Structures are given as C-alpha cells and as structure tokens.
DNA sequence: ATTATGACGCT
DNA sequence: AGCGTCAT
C-alpha cells in the first residue's frame, strides 16, 4: 500500500543511435544516403559478414549476422560499405570517433553511462527537477513532444502513424497533472522534452539520427528505446507495465536472452514477464538465486534499482581476430606475426587513449582459442603492461601464452589457433 | 567461416 | 586470477 515503493524515484533515458556504422558511412558518402545499405567486415568470404543494416534495407530481410552474398540475394540493389583493414584486421577507429561526438553531446545534458559504441543510459531526474521549477506549473506543449511516443496509448474511443502517435500523445497530455511536481508521471513527460533536445541536438551537430527510451530505469529505458525505432523516442510510463509486460516474451528483456531466460520459461511454465508477478521474491530466489531472484521480482513489476554510471569512456581497450578453418595459425612465427599486428593496433590506441583521457592501461589480457574449441575463449592469462611498446607486449603475450603449444617440434603451433585477443585493463590516472 | 569487441558475474 | 554469460 502506501509503504510498497513503487520504483518512479528516478526518470532515466536510453539513447541508441539508428544503423549506426550504417549512419557514418552515409554521412560520409553521400550516395548511400536513404538507400539500403549495410556495412560488412572483410570480403572474400562470402561478401564479408553484415554487422549494420539501413531500414531501408531491412525492410527486404537483410539483417546482422548475414553473409553480404546472402543479402544480395534479398535485396540486389544492396549498398555496401567495408570496414576499414589495418595491419590485416578490421579497424573500426572511425565508429570510434563518431561515437565520441555523440557522447560528447549527450554530456552537455546530463552524466551518462557509455554501455556500448552507439548507446548511454542518461540520468535526467536533476535535470527534470530543474526544467520543472522553471516551468512554473505551465502545462506542456505537444509541440514540444514532436517525435514521442506514449507506450500503450492511445486506449479506447484513426488510421496513420504519425495520427496514432499524436492521439496517444493527446490522451496522455490531457490526463496529466501538471500541479503536482513530484508526479512521476509529470517527471517523465518533462524528461522526454529533455530527450527530444538532447536528440536534436545530436543530429544538427553530427548528422546522426538516433532513438531514445524514457522510463524510471534502465531496463525499461532500453526496451522502450526499441519500440519506435529508427528516429523516435518513447515513454513507458509506471502505468504501462502491466499491459506491457503481459505479452512480452522473457528473452525481449535484456540479460534474460540466453540460457537464464531459458531456464525461467523452463523451470516456471512461463512464456512472459508479466507471468512472473505470480511467484514469491523467495520462490524466484529459490530457482534463480539471491541476486537474480530479487532483480526478477521487482523487474516483472516494472521497477530496477541498477545506476547509471558516471562512466563516459570504455573500461577496457581490446584488439581481436579471429582464424577460421583452415587460416589458423600454426607456426610459432605466425603467431608472432599477428601478435605483433594486435600489439600494434593496441599501442596506437591506448596512446591515442592516454593523451585524450589522462589515464594509463596496467594490466595485459591475452585470450586465445584453439582448434576444435566452441568456447569463446580457450585460455586467458594476464601479465603487468609497464609501457606502450607494441613489441613488447606482443613478446610478453607470446610469453604468457607459449606454455598452450602442444608441438613438440619448435616451428609449428598445436593445436593451431583461432583467435587471439589483446585486452588493455586496470586504468589508473596519469 | 558470423566477427569484433565490451561489460560484468562467479568462484 | 581465470572462466562463463550476455550483448550485438
Ligand atoms: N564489430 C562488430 N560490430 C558490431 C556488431 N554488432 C553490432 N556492431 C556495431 C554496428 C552497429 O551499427 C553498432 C551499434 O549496435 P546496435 O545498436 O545493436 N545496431 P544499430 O545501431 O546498427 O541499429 P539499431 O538502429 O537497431 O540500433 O555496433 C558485431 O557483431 N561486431
Ligand atoms: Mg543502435
Ligand atoms: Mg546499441
């Protein structure tokens, strides 16, 4: 009752830039602008793998994951951008840079969390605090909303997009009371004005467009985020996660998409997470443990106590390649070769790093995987990382790693290598 | 022969 | 410290 929190103490957004690699490229060559593209890694395999997709382009099926000769078979008008190749692997230092002016910008707002290359969780509840005292009781505009959506509006008592977007925005509006300042309902509305500047400023300064979730926390910012995309933003409201959650399979629900979500629709007889509302915090605990137990009850009731970090830079600068099937490496000076590439890669950023961020890397992680291994990673070993000298940390990673070759013979590499991963770790400020 | 990362939990 | 999970 009037004890039960009801977690609407904070307003959160979730900005995620639309096809984003895709987005980069078009700013930067015009021709492929509003046309179905995607950007694919490598070449000769196949096409190279897809990892962007315009909208344009899905709407023909072409997805993430697909092999470029596939998608062509989709959509033969296709439009295709490479990644960049440096030392003899993919390079993807120019989405690096253009995710920095993006977040960048969002900074000017608020204290974000960077949680990936094209997204940041925002915490806009200070914010809203303050655009409220300034807006002196005035109600809100929808013209101030022009790009919002309300999740599960409009209800009841009509046919295009953009019609059904303002009626849902309309109800939504009537029905709020601007009086009140500690309505989270209010706090929301008033975070979403936030949002709309916040992307539109991102566009007029970068040329991207993005979406944008607003919700109480980060796992509702994030699915709303996904509702209306590309270039629109929603607000799910406290109110709307019942109906919300009633249909909404357990795997939508970002972190339940693998084995742990399988294993809730497994063990409980449940398809969504509203269905979760009907066991115990005990029960959840019982089957889950402590902490997922207690994250999966107060989630299936809307409510999630995760921070959004004040962590605008990556905590780790990583170098990795991959060696399929019959390219692995098995000779001692292929490894070595390709050591020294990742080694690299890895000084020029990490230097790069150190000038724009005052920050030096202390520790080394070298992952490997060998033939006929389905995990991800084989082995990782960690050694100290003293200086930004790419010969020696490909000789230190040689060294931390060489103990793997099962060759008897000192030429050769057994079993041959399929991946090798370079990981700069453990910041401290310089 | 999806690939290249990045975050984070577990023990 | 090293491994597993999840994301995409
Ligand atoms: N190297 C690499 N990059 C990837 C991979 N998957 C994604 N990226 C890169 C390319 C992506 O552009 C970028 C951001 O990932 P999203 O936000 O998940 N997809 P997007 O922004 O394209 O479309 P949406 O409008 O649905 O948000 O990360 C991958 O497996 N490997
Ligand atoms: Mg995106
Ligand atoms: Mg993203």
């Keep these: 009752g009037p004890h039960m929190a009801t977690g609407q103490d904070r307003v959160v957004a979730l900005v995620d830039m639309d096809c984003f690699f895709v987005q980069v490229e078009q700013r930067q060559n015009p ?98 605090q303050e655009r409220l005292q300034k807006l002196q009781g005035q109600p809100i505009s929808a013209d101030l909303l022009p790009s919002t959506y309300i999740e599960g509006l409009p209800q009841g008592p009509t046919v295009q997009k953009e019609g059904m977007r303002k009626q849902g925005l309309f109800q939504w509006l009537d029905s709020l009371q601007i009086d009140n300042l500690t309505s989270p309902d209010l706090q929301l509305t008033v975070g979403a004005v936030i949002v709309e500047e916040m992307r539109a400023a991102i566009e007029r300064e970068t040329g991207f467009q993005c979406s944008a979730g607003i919700s109480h926390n980060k796992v509702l910012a994030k699915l709303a985020c996904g509702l209306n995309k590309p270039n629109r933003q929603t607000l799910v409201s406290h109110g709307s996660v019942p109906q919300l959650f009633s249909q909404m399979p357990i795997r939508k629900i970002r972190s339940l998409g693998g084995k742990l979500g399988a294993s809730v629709i497994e063990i409980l007889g449940i398809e969504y997470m509203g269905e979760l509302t009907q066991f115990t915090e005990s029960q959840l605990q019982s089957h889950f443990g402590e902490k997922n137990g207690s994250w999966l009850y107060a989630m299936c009731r809307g409510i999630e106590h995760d921070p959004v970090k004040p962590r605008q830079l990556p905590k780790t600068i990583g170098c990795s390649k991959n060696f399929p099937g019959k390219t692995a490496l098995a000779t001692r000076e292929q490894v070595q070769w390709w050591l020294l590439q990742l080694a690299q890669e890895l000084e020029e950023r990490l230097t790069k790093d150190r000038n724009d961020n005052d920050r030096v890397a202390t520790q080394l992680v070298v992952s490997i995987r060998v033939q006929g291994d389905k995990r991800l990673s084989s082995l990782r070993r960690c050694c100290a990382l003293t200086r930004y000298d790419a010969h020696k940390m490909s000789h230190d990673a040689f ?4 103990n793997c070759n099962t060759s008897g013979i000192q030429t050769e590499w057994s079993p041959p290598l399929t991946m090798l991963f370079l990981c700069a770790t453990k910041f401290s400020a310089s």
């Design 31 to 128: 021709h492929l602008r509003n046309k179905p593209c995607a950007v694919v890694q490598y070449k000769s395999w196949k096409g190279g793998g897809i990892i962007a997709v315009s909208y344009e382009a899905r709407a023909f099926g072409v997805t993430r994951s697909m092999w470029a000769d596939d998608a062509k078979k989709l959509c033969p008008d296709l439009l295709l951008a490479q990644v960049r190749e440096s030392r003899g692997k993919a390079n993807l230092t120019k989405y690096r840079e253009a995710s920095v002016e993006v977040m960048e910008i969002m900074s000017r707002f608020a204290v974000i969390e960077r949680a990936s290359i094209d997204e940041a969780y925002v915490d806009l509840t200070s914010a809203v």
């Design 399 to 402: 060294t931390v790693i060489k």
